Design an enzyme around this catalytic site. Structure first.
Site, PDB file in Angstrom:
ATOM      1  N   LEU A 246       0.822  -1.202   0.000  1.00 31.15           N
ATOM      2  CA  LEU A 246       0.000   0.000   0.000  1.00 31.15           C
ATOM      3  C   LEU A 246       0.860   1.258   0.000  1.00 31.15           C
ATOM      4  O   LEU A 246       1.919   1.310   0.633  1.00 31.15           O
ATOM      5  CB  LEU A 246      -0.927  -0.001   1.212  1.00 31.15           C
ATOM      6  CG  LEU A 246      -1.872  -1.198   1.324  1.00 31.15           C
ATOM      7  CD1 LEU A 246      -2.836  -0.996   2.478  1.00 31.15           C
ATOM      8  CD2 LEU A 246      -2.625  -1.424   0.021  1.00 31.15           C
ATOM      9  N   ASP A 247       0.395   2.274  -0.720  1.00 32.89           N
ATOM     10  CA  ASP A 247       1.048   3.569  -0.787  1.00 32.89           C
ATOM     11  C   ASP A 247       0.381   4.541   0.186  1.00 32.89           C
ATOM     12  O   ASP A 247      -0.434   4.156   1.030  1.00 32.89           O
ATOM     13  CB  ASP A 247       1.019   4.101  -2.219  1.00 32.89           C
ATOM     14  CG  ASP A 247      -0.369   4.515  -2.655  1.00 32.89           C
ATOM     15  OD1 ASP A 247      -1.302   3.696  -2.526  1.00 32.89           O
ATOM     16  OD2 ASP A 247      -0.529   5.665  -3.113  1.00 32.89           O
TER      17      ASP A 247
END
Lengths: 459, 182, 128, 62, 178, 119, 153, 168, 78, 108, 85
Positions: K39-40
């Site tokens: 995830l960013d």
């Protein structure tokens, strides 16, 4: 009248010769008894005043004021006990003697039959008040406040003394009965205009009039709690009583001369209540509220109509009780936090609920919630002003709205919101403080049931 | 805002010089509006202090009793015939039309009645209809005797008090007997 | 090009629409660091006094005392009669007084004229 | 005391009394509306008439 | 529980906050969940479009224009969580919150109504009174010579030492005091 | 509301003025008109405490309705016939007022026709 | 005590001393214009209502959203959260005033027009007996009223 | 025990009950229950208390003040005669106030009693209060807070001089 | 009486308007990753809700039956 | 997210906060002060219901009725009732009766 | 609604498992979204919004950005709601 005067005098030797432990107790017992004795004066014959002797008489105007004074002394003693604990016994006795001398002078002012005796004692009241403010005040500004108070009052009074002596020389007597019965009308002349000014200005200074009220905020903020109590409750009403008594001599010229003072008061009540909206000091807020109510009383007196006079007497008594209680409530928080800034102490309702209830009732009376005697007096004054001019209602209603706003604003800021986290010295309210607030409140609510007692002679 | 609009309708009725009808409308409004607010309070308490309709949805079946009460209250408020609103609001509008009146006042009253129907539709549609939008944990429970009985009394009132009171009270206004069908 | 938001005295410009928030310089960041340092020092002192188990009473805030003194005491010593001060004082002090005098005097004179002319209704006005 | 157990992501448990009472009161509302409409119709009490004939009021015609 | 703020908001942090505000306002506009999901994926794509802009001036100008768009398109009455600032229940139970120091002023009869809790409270008082001196020493030692440049406070370095300035955070009133 | 359309959008002179109504005298046209007889007596009204707005030419039907309402209590559904009677009398009074309005309309039009006849 | 506010600063040293006294940055510190109002040394803090300040941040005074030692706005009491608020509005202030005032004006104008053109019904005046209830409406019995006559239609 | 002449009340005309329906009237049974539960015990208690009062009956008397010379015949600076006249005038002022109160009480009672016919059937009381109000206003209004018999006499003389000027 | 959360796998976008939204997104080349979390709202007993007219006509069936019965009584008795 | 020092501080404060909360829990016993009025089983179902009914309505109604008897007699005009609507029909004392003679047309 | 620690953990893990981008099998209490997962930043914002919507209480952004771990979310929720067990 000596039934009240002589025991009041005897209070002084009793206080001086009482043991160091028992000074407050003995003073309180006997002052309350003196007030119970004073309660007899309320019975006034409708047609005529109670002329006890040559020197002293009482009417339906003087009797409520005397009862107020006699009731006020024990309350002042209870309030002043706390902050005078550290004082030496001689100093505490001196303070109590100043209070007793003040009560004696006030009683003799309200009962005196001769205007010159009234003036002598009414000016004599300054000395104990000045000593109290300048000796037992807690700030460096007490000296300046005492100077302002003394010099304003004297600058007003000295021309009154000259005018009273001139009246004695012309008419021949200064007894209020003879003056009322003879009471020849004045003529519109510059000499008579200046006599009118001389008679009126001393009382206009005593009743804080807009532009002459500067002494009141300094005095009330800088004085100790008991001194503030007398100043709010009785010392201002000294002006109202004097003006009501003295208005008999100046019958026709009042119509011409009232407009400056009438307009000054009518605008000043709005101005002073607006000042109350933005005050940063609780004592100052209460002082300006007193100025506004006294301006209403000034309007009522100047209008010179029966309903105006009845409302004036009712407002005098009711305001005296309300302002004394409000000063006591503020003093409690001042003792707890040692600052008069409104913002410093917040959310005290959670910490002190019964005190919050006292604050609520005091503010409700201050904003003239019916059927409080405050509203009875204010409404009578408003109706009299409306008969004087229908346009007065605009100013009167605006003043009422702002009074409600500032009263509930003080209540909301001091007693609502989140508690100030860092303040940790708040402690459970003592039975003395709650007793003092109750002694202020219960008479006020009770007087609503029988309002004829505080409606004055014209009732 | 619905309460304020109904108060304005009462003030209009006073303006049309029909005071007793305004008193009747006050009497009926007490019932149905208090019931509507109680239903709102039930919805709020069920949804953990949530008052935004956007976060409320699909409550028609989740809360059957509050749904029935709110539907009845909305119908009474919007002037559904032979409900409490019909005995008051319908007579109000009929008297307003059949009287010497400021034109814009009458037009605004009719438009306001339309908007009352509109916001009743809004609350019903967003809250009870549709799919649930409330937070996951479902705590809906109207099975409380106090809530049920308190809403029951005002429901019965909204349904029948209008007829009962209107029949019992003495006639105080000359009725607008004949009027155009529209 | 959506219509722009005109800031006013009672509707301040949002930080998001601040033209200066997007024009940052090293000195601006330095000033922000200095302000954060000041706030941190003050918060440290306050919390040190606030969490002290020995302290009993108010934590006297000098800022509050300064605010009260400036609002009450410092006004007159730092006042100078100037044309703006004098003119505003004259206006907002006496002008309303004369305005109300005019209004009420005209009203009272009209009433007295009607009374003298016997052209005023006081049929039941028996409580003044 | 858990009369209705809160359900994480399913339709809440409904006691029968809620459904029965809600249905009863809604049915009562509709029954009252229909009953009043059938017994008493507020539609009209004499069609709004127009007095066309001139001789009825005035027919001078000079 | 709030973290000490920084002197400035980094560009990444500002973009994140704008994204969160935009999603929340879109949710306020898109009441129904499906429509909200559609337009939220659209917004995520819009952010991803310029996610990798190399020119910081260009990214900053894009941020400014997007903020202007947000202000025009903000919901007049955005959804507020009930306990969040501006929410219906924000600070509702504040009056019920009572500071711990009010206990020390209890009358002995009331304190005898609950002895055991007050024994525990005395233990906590002893703990705080003992730990204060070490906390002050630690704060002096770790503080830079110029002065604390951030509101952040150090953790306990050694066993037997409590976190500096811990009393009020630990003994803060319960969210739902009742 | 159509009458209002004629009054405002159209010629105002032809349409009657509600405040001014009735401008033309009763004697004009209508060769013999009977006085609107009052079934009820003034004392009866005063004794029944009828509202002044309700003290109209149909106050008798209302008097009977009030008597039946007082006698029928507790039953409040027993005065439907008396209610209908009073309602119909009010309807007829309304119809008569409508006929007055139409009469005024036609009379104004006839006056306009006389003025046209001059030209 | 130098802590108490002083006169209007006129030299840069005075300005620096005042800035340190009010615990403000020297460049940020800006005293009120010395026009005789009496502000003197006190700084001209931005006119931001306490509502605008971020609620989430831990304030020394949470209800007031103010930290200890921070210079206090001259009209802070005016800008408390319970009083006059300057927080940004979604719509421009001028546009809000335009819309509200225009709406009210149009409302009153249309009501005046309705007064010009009042709605009514195509009926004749309600006829009342006994000379339109002359006696019942308070008419003097001794005086003779005009004998109002209502004829059948 | 109030005099009917002082406080007039129109004779009471109460319609007789003429039921026309079979359903029992709840008001009748509720009134009978109220009678039995409340009125009878209250009547018994008042019977007891009236018996006790009759056991010890004592009388209080209404004071009579002989008329005294008015301010009109009182000499100047003659404080004794001026005092007597002033107190007499104050008593007369109170009596006139009470008379106005009686007329106003009649007015209020008549407004309530007539009901929807108040505008017509209370006209006589309205005229009575009109006369009493005009007289009271002419006699006492505008005297001021410090009203005195001398000021009332001065008002009367001003009025009579105006009347002579009107007579021309 | 500890609460038990339902199995996470049971939530699916299929048979829900969320699937239509996902189809639109895939048509434009986007994928929504949160559909399964919002799936519960469109699933179970919550799936079916009456219309506004249906909501208004609640109990109208039983009300009409009661009306018919009562009208039959009124007509039959006389 | 947090710095390791920040994580450690937060964890410490978390542990101490949970300790404080668990120390806020009371014991199994809530000590109370140690029969003022005897109340065996006193039928709260109906007897207490009747007692409430009496004390709250019957006593006030008696007191108010007595005050009504006093106040009505003490002063004239204290109670003024609207003159009962005398619809044409028998009166109790005057026994007056009148008919409008249906001088109208019946058909509807 | 006691809202015990285990309940908070279960609900947070439930939301994360319902997240398509996170594969359920490797999801763990200590699985950092930035490092352990893919995830960013924007995914962190989205999961924080999902958590705050699930629990109905709003997480301030300064605190929200610093979670970076499901266990951190759980303990933060516990701290906010005064969960001590």
């Amino acid at each position: 009248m000596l039934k009240i005067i002589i025991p009041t005098t005897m209070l002084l030797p009793m206080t001086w010769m009482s043991k160091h432990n028992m000074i407050w107790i003995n003073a309180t017992v006997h002052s309350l008894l003196i007030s119970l004795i004073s309660l007899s004066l309320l019975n006034q014959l409708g047609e005529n005043s109670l002329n006890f002797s040559l020197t002293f008489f009482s009417d339906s105007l003087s009797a409520p004021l005397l009862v107020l004074t006699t009731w006020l002394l024990p309350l002042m003693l209870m309030a002043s006990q706390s902050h005078l604990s550290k004082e030496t016994t001689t100093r505490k006795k001196l303070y109590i003697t100043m209070l007793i001398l003040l009560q004696l002078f006030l009683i003799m002012t309200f009962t005196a039959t001769e205007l010159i005796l009234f003036y002598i004692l009414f000016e004599a009241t300054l000395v104990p008040t000045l000593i109290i403010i300048t000796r037992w005040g807690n700030q460096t500004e007490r000296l300046n406040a005492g100077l302002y108070f003394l010099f304003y009052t004297l600058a007003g009074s000295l021309p009154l003394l000259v005018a009273l002596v001139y009246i004695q020389n012309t008419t021949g007597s200064l007894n209020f009965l003879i003056i009322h019965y003879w009471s020849h009308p004045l003529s519109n002349s510059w000499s008579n205009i200046f006599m009118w000014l001389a008679c009126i200005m001393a009382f206009m200074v005593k009743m804080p009039l807009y532009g002459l009220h500067l002494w009141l905020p300094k005095a009330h903020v800088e004085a100790p709690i008991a001194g503030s109590m007398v100043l709010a409750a009785v010392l201002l009403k000294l002006g109202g009583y004097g003006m009501m008594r003295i208005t008999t001599i100046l019958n026709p010229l009042t119509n011409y001369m009232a407009y400056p003072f009438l307009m000054l008061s009518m605008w000043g009540m709005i101005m002073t209540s607006s000042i109350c909206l933005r005050q940063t000091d609780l004592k100052s807020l209460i002082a300006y509220s007193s100025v506004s109510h006294m301006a209403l009383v000034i309007v009522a007196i100047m209008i010179q109509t029966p309903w105006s006079f009845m409302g004036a007497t009712a407002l005098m008594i009711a305001h005296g009780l309300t302002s004394s209680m409000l000063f006591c409530l503020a003093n409690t928080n001042y003792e707890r936090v040692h600052s008069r800034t409104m913002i410093l102490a917040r959310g005290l309702q959670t910490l002190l609920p019964l005190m919050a209830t006292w604050w609520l009732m005091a503010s409700l009376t201050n904003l003239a919630l019916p059927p409080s005697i405050n509203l009875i007096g204010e409404l009578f004054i408003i109706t009299a002003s409306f008969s004087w001019s229908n346009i007065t209602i605009i100013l009167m209603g605006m003043n009422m709205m702002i009074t409600a706003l500032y009263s509930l604003y003080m209540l909301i800021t001091t007693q609502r919101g989140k508690y100030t986290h860092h303040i940790n010295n708040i402690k459970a309210s003592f039975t003395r403080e709650n007793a003092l607030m109750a002694l202020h409140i219960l008479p006020l609510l009770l007087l609503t049931l029988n309002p004829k007692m505080i409606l004055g002679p014209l009732y | 805002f619905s309460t304020s609009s109904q108060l304005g309708l009462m003030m209009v009725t006073i303006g049309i010089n029909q005071p007793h009808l305004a008193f009747l409308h006050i009497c009926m409004h007490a019932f149905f509006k208090a019931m509507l607010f109680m239903c709102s309070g039930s919805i709020i308490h069920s949804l953990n202090d949530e008052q935004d309709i956007r976060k409320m949805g699909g409550l028609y079946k989740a809360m059957p009793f509050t749904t029935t009460a709110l539907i009845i209250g909305s119908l009474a408020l919007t002037g559904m015939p032979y409900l409490t609103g019909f005995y008051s609001k319908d007579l109000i509008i009929e008297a307003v039309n059949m009287s010497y009146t400021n034109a814009w006042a009458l037009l605004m009253t009719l438009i306001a009645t339309s908007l009352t129907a509109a916001y009743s539709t809004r609350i019903i549609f967003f809250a009870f209809l549709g799919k649930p939008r409330f937070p996951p944990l479902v705590l809906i429970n109207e099975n409380n005797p106090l809530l049920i009985n308190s809403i029951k009394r005002l429901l019965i009132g909204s349904i029948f008090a209008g007829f009962i009171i209107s029949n019992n009270i003495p006639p105080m206004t000359v009725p607008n007997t004949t009027m155009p069908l529209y | 090009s959506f219509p722009k938001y005109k800031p006013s005295r009672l509707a301040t410009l949002p930080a998001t629409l601040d033209p200066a928030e997007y024009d940052i310089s090293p000195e601006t960041r330095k000033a922000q660091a200095e302000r954060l340092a000041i706030r941190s020092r003050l918060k440290r002192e306050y919390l040190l006094q606030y969490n002290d188990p020995n302290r009993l009473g108010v934590i006297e805030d000098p800022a509050l005392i300064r605010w009260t003194y400036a609002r009450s005491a410092n006004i007159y010593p730092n006042f100078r009669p100037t044309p703006k001060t004098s003119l505003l004082g004259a206006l907002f002090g006496i002008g309303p007084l004369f305005f109300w005098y005019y209004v009420f005097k005209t009203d009272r004179d009209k009433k007295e004229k009607l009374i003298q002319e016997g052209k005023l209704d006081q049929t039941f006005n028996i409580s003044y | 005391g858990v009369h209705i157990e809160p359900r994480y992501r399913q339709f809440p448990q409904l006691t029968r009394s809620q459904l029965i009472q809600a249905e009863f009161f809604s049915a009562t509302m509709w029954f009252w509306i229909l009953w009043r409409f059938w017994h008493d119709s507020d539609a009209v009490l004499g069609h709004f008439p127009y007095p066309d004939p001139s001789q009825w009021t005035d027919e001078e015609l000079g | 529980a709030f973290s000490a703020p920084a002197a400035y908001l980094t560009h990444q942090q500002k973009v994140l906050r704008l994204y969160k505000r935009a999603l929340r306002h879109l949710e306020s506009w898109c009441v129904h969940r499906d429509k909200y999901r559609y337009f939220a994926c659209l917004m995520r794509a819009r952010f991803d479009e310029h996610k990798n802009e190399k020119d910081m001036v260009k990214a900053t100008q894009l941020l400014r224009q997007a903020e202007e768009e947000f202000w025009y398109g903000q919901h007049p009455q955005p959804y507020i969580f009930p306990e969040s600032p501006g929410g219906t229940s924000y600070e509702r139970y504040e009056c019920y919150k009572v500071p711990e120091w009010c206990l020390d002023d209890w009358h002995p009869s009331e304190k005898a109504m609950y002895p055991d809790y007050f024994a525990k409270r005395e233990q906590w008082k002893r703990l705080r009174r003992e730990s204060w001196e070490r906390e002050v020493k630690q704060l002096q030692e770790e503080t830079p010579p110029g002065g604390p440049r951030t509101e952040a406070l150090p953790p306990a370095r050694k066993e037997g030492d409590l976190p500096p300035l811990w009393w009020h955070i630990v003994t803060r009133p319960r969210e739902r005091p009742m | 509301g159509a009458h209002l359309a004629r009054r405002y959008l159209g010629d105002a002179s032809k349409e009657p003025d509600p405040l001014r109504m009735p401008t033309f005298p009763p004697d004009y046209g209508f060769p013999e008109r009977k006085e609107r007889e009052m079934v009820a007596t003034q004392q009866e009204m005063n004794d029944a405490q009828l509202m002044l707005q309700q003290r109209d030419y149909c106050a008798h039907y209302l008097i009977q309705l009030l008597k039946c309402k007082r006698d029928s209590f507790p039953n409040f559904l027993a005065c439907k016939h008396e209610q209908h009677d009073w309602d119909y009398c009010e309807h007829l009074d309304y119809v008569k007022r409508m006929k007055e309005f139409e009469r005024e309309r036609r009379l104004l039009q006839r006056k306009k026709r006389r003025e046209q006849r001059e030209a | 005590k130098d802590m108490f506010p002083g006169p209007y600063p006129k030299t840069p040293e005075e300005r620096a001393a005042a800035a340190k006294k009010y615990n403000m940055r020297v460049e940020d510190y800006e005293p009120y214009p010395d026009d005789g109002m009496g502000y003197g040394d006190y700084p001209k803090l931005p006119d931001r209502s306490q509502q605008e300040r971020d609620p989430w941040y831990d304030w020394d005074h949470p209800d007031l959203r103010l930290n200890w030692g921070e210079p206090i706005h001259w009209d802070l009491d005016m800008y408390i959260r319970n009083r006059v608020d300057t927080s940004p509005t979604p719509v421009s202030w001028n546009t809000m005033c335009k819309h509200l005032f225009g709406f009210v004006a149009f409302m009153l104008f249309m009501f005046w027009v309705g007064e010009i053109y009042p709605s009514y019904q195509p009926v004749g005046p309600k006829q009342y007996p006994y000379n339109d209830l002359y006696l019942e409406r308070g008419g003097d019995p001794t005086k003779e009223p005009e004998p109002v006559v209502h004829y059948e239609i | 025990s109030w005099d009917k002449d002082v406080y007039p009340e129109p004779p009471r005309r109460t319609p007789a009950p003429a039921p026309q329906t079979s359903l029992p009237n709840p008001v009748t049974y509720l009134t009978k229950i109220f009678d039995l539960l409340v009125d009878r015990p209250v009547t018994l208690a008042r019977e007891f208390i009236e018996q006790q009062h009759a056991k010890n009956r004592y009388y209080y008397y209404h004071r009579e003040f002989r008329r005294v010379p008015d301010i009109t015949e009182c000499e100047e600076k003659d404080i004794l005669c001026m005092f007597e006249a002033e107190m007499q005038w104050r008593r007369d002022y109170k009596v006139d106030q009470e008379i106005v109160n009686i007329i106003q009480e009649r007015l209020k009672a008549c407004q309530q009693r007539e009901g929807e016919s108040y505008r017509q059937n209370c006209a006589k009381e309205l005229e009575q209060f009109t006369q009493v109000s005009k007289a009271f206003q002419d006699r006492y209004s505008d005297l001021g807070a410090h009203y005195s018999a001398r000021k009332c006499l001065a008002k009367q003389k001003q009025r009579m001089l105006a009347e002579r000027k009107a007579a021309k | 009486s500890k609460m038990e959360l339902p199995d996470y796998k049971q939530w699916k976008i299929e048979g829900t308007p969320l699937e239509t939204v996902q189809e639109k997104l895939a048509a434009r080349g986007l994928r929504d990753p949160w559909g399964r979390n919002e799936a519960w709202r469109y699933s179970g007993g919550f799936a079916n809700n009456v219309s506004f007219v249906g909501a208004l006509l609640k109990g109208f069936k039983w009300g009409f039956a009661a009306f018919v019965v009562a009208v039959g009584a009124e007509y039959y008795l006389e | 997210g947090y710095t390791p020092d920040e994580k450690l501080r937060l964890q410490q404060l978390r542990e101490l906060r949970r300790r404080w909360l668990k120390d806020q829990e009371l014991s199994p016993r809530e000590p109370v002060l140690p029969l003022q009025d005897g109340a065996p089983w006193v039928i709260y179902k109906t007897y207490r219901h009747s007692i409430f009914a009496v004390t709250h309505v019957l006593i006030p109604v008696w007191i108010i009725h007595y005050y009504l008897k006093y106040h009505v007699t003490a002063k004239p005009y204290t109670v003024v009732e609207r003159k009962p609507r005398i619809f044409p029909g028998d009166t109790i004392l005057e026994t007056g009766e009148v008919i409008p003679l249906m001088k109208e047309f019946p058909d509807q | 609604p006691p809202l015990t620690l285990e309940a908070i953990k279960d609900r947070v893990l439930y939301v994360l498992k319902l997240y398509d981008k996170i594969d359920p099998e490797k999801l763990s209490v200590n699985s950092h979204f930035m490092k352990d997962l893919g995830l960013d930043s924007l995914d962190q914002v989205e999961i924080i919004m999902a958590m705050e919507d699930e629990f109905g209480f709003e997480i301030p952004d300064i605190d929200a950005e610093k979670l970076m771990c499901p266990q951190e979310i759980v303990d933060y929720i516990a701290d906010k709601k005064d969960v001590y067990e």
